[PDB]
């Protein structure tokens, strides 16, 4: 499977 | 109405703070000896506007340096290090009576060492007034 | 000064002067104290001071003075007792016994001089070890009789019996010969029936708690060795588990006794004993619940409050519960009337496991491991403990410690992980629910803290591999989602840093998920690359560590072309490496290149692997070509600290990639090899020139240290490759000769302070891997490093510590792989080789002593392998007895006890050579013994003479019996070692029994 | 308010080096065996006032043992030291404990495994269990890196004062006096400075 929303939210991880 | 249940640095300003290891030179043995590792702080007294070095050991927090940054002092390189300074101190009261020492202080980087020298000389100018 | 008068024995001892010296030492300070200390030490060590203990013990009014007098007597009794005239032996016994009696009869002295009475009791025990029972058969009967006439004497007798038991059963192994220990153990066993009667009578009837406590203290010692019948065929378990648990004065010692009872050797087929074992546990737990605290009590809080002896009690309760339950819980698991007891006991352990005390937690955690492993494997058991295990899941998750410098913490994490993995298998649904629930209370803020989100992340990461892949899938997604939203919702880089780190930690722990979700793995990596530009403290280190960690586990997914991608991802990493690493420190850049080397080595097509390798090394190879063009056109440039640092980081990058690629690194090594060794020589010249112009102090300067770093990293690079090379023909034909030409002369002809010990380490790897193929190369190594390194390290045991260690590692491997090189040594140099080995014996440094003893053993074997040829015959003639006497010296000098086992092995090999007639020539001179004398006879004669002169206080019979036993036992290492230990005991005293050496029969 | 602390253990385990570190801040690299005992006052500043330890640093080598257990009399606390790079020093821990508790029957005792800075550790954490049944506190320590170097005194202070919440605090830092260098001593000081400049600092590869 893919779980594309996990990926999306992962791509947006920010330290600030 | 319900009755409810029942350092001497406060008057100073921290101009500079850096982690460092302090050594004292034992002339009789001609070896350097560690005196402490911890934060070295330049503290400006709000009443007198005079700046001192204050350095405490990690964990035990015992004082390993406490003396005015006299304008007469001169920071000199040590033959074995590009990140340390050597200088004579005529009155340090870390252990009690104002004793004289030849100190060396080492830093994590040549960059921290050079900035220490920058701040050190700025502070000397403060104390000249 | 005046205090030194007590040291003048030609006069009478002034007791009041002694007491002033003693007071000044114990109560004084500074210079006075120090001076008195040295006087007291000189007084005590006077070999006639014992003659004045009689006076001190009668006429002094200072307890410290009498204590010192007893210490003096102790030295005499334990070392010279049997040398005394029999009158002094009787006299000393009499006034020790009498002094003990008189102190017990004076109730004031008995209560206020406990330390002095205890010392006197121990001194008495020393005499018993010498005199009892053979010359004092009435001691025990008279002790029992005298116990009835006074509570004080009875209590003190319990102390004497306690110390006697300790000296005979607990501390005899090191301090007595095997025969004497057995003699004393049999003697106590013979008369223990009487001893127990007195002990049990006191416990059953007495009311003095100080007497009860002392009796229980002695019982604790007895439980180490007595037969179980004394415990199970009497009423004593009832007394221990009821009466003595109610009073706090006796509760601590009684609990310790019951812990040892839980270790008695006991038959496991007797139903009545099983019921007794159940019963005393039932009694003990009942007393705890009614007299101490109920099972709901908050032991974490109690322990933290630290009132009275609560901490020691809770420690002892944990030891009791874990000890008993690890052995006997099956006794409680079938009978339904025992189920409440079983679970209450474990509920106490749950409560104990919440205490904030690292070492106590490890004790309970060891028990939990024992339990959950059994529930994992043992049919029909896990349902019993469902509620205990559910609570334990929460306990362990909430006290998870950091997994990845603190080695105490590393071990604890691994132990916690092991227990939690078992607990997850036992109920995977409950485990998941606890973790998701804990996560919710991080988001809702009710338990949010830096420590708490870290702890939970470590716990989640620790159970990887326990869930099904589909459950893991849903679980991972849930966690990552919740964690991402948690980071988004926090303010400031500090909070966002902590959470982003934990996110990457969890991800790195689930490679199975990553391997099956490429788009996810790709996004993970690209985020790490973004983080390699973040300057917040720690983000860059975290990004690099996570990167290489993921690569080690998922490398295959970087080297294949993935569906919907136009190239293996490793190519994409390489293309952008400069940007990706632009903001990283050198150390972190090297980690990145090392991670790339892991991936590249999974490419098994050689042409594609070498192309990836050359592409990966493009940046360092270009910087390298540049500097080789510059530093060659103007060797002065190398004095530029910035160029030196650039060079070192280039070499370090090659080391990093070589570390992960090993044999596959050869093409890159070939690109730089010849110019690298030329650089090695140029740097070597600059170091020498600087030492010449500035003196030895040059070696401390940053310039020279930077230059030597280049040399060390070059050596490390070659060592790293050669240690992993698979084509050894290329190593020998292409690498070795240029290497030796570059490093050996430079090492030999530098002053000692400029020699790099890394040269020795590099040579050790060369010899290890291809030594068998370069016999002339090995000879050249020895010629260039052996004598000049030996001269550095053979004046003391401390200077040049690294050269010392690497020196003997090199000799060891040369002796293993190219012994022929030592055969070529001229006789004077081979003698230095033998001296060097023995020099290694005498080191206390373990990293030298062990190799030295192994070199000696390997050397003897190498010589033996040669058969009956002149070199072997000359070796034995020249060096056999040197090795025997040097090995004996370190065995017996009490300063090399760490090497006993290997010293013994070497000595046994040497002795067995002679008694297997494996030495073909006589070991003696023509004149000093008749023709035909066997080497066996001469060896025994040589050894008798050696030991007679080295230990003149031994009798000829002692020496002869010791050597007869040692010789007989030279095929049996364990017994041989026992005989050596017996000898080490006997040389510490006068008058050892020579029949002791017949112990093995 | 002072407490006699006796420190025992095999020779070479780091007892004297540990105490020196606390006394002056220095790390002595040389092994000069203690002869008998050396007594040093050591004061810590806490939130309950200062606590003074009278540390009796005893000799671990048998030939230098001096009065041996005579040093233990009236001790109120103790540290037993071993070396995690030397198994034999841990094997001897029960012997030092035996001799100590025969004289000091109920005192707080810390067991310290020293030299954890050394990579090739020989006494593994999991092997260290002797403290459990004897109710000793245990710490991994390093006098060289200062790992946990304060914990033994902190724990003992809490036991001796009877306050589990006792903490070390920052001793007050008086104002330092003004400088007036003597023009006569100016030649002597530039001399001593030249020597100090040309004596290399030790351990130049340490992080500090
Ligand atoms: N690497 C390392 N060395 C240490 C450490 N502590 C002490 N040492 C070193 O170990 C050696 C012995 O030190 P020392 O304090 O004299 O041990 P001791 O227990 O007092 N010996 P004795 O009982 O004979 O007086 C010294 O060289 C010292 O520098 C440590 O924590 N780490
Ligand atoms: Mg010492």
Numbering used by the authors:
A (entry chain D): -1 to 0, 1082 to 1095
B (entry chain B): 64 to 69, 78 to 200
C (entry chain C): -1 to 376, 414 to 439, 457 to 1053
D (entry chain A): 9 to 216
The authors write:
NES sequences are very diverse but each usually has 4–5 hydrophobic residues (often Leu/Val/Ile/Phe/Met; labeled Ф0–5) that bind hydrophobic pockets (labeled P0–P4) in a hydrophobic groove formed by HEAT repeats 11 and 12 of CRM1 (9–16). Here, eight new structures of CRM1 bound to diverse NESs show several different and unexpected NES backbone conformations that share only a common one-turn helix element. All NESs also participate in hydrogen bonding with Lys568 of HsCRM1, and mutagenic/structural analysis identifies Lys568 as a selectivity filter that blocks binding of non-NES peptides.
Black dashes show CRM1-NES hydrogen bonds and polar contacts, and unoccupied CRM1 hydrophobic pockets are labeled. *HDAC5NES and PaxNES sequences match the class 1b pattern, but both peptides bind CRM1 using Ф residues that match class 1a pattern. (A–E) FMRPNES (light orange), SMAD4NES (salmon), HDACNES (slate), PaxNES (pale cyan) and FMRP-1bNES (deep teal) bound to the ScCRM1 groove. For example, (+) HDAC5NES: Φ2 Ψ = −43.5°, Φ2+1Ψ = −21.7°, Φ2+2Ψ = −1.3°, Φ3 Ψ = 133.8° and (−) CPEB4NES: Φ2+2Ψ = −40.2°, Φ2+1Ψ = −31.0°, Φ2 Ψ = 16.5°, Φ2-1Ψ = 111.5°. *Residues in SNUPNNES plotted are Φ2+1, Φ2+2, Φ2+3 and Φ3. In all (+) NESs, main chain carbonyls of Φ2+1 and Φ3 residues in the 1-turn helix element hydrogen bonds with the ScCRM1 Lys579 (or MmCRM1/HsCRM1 Lys568) side chain, much like niche3/4 motifs where carbonyls of residues i and i + 2 or i + 3 coordinate a cationic group.
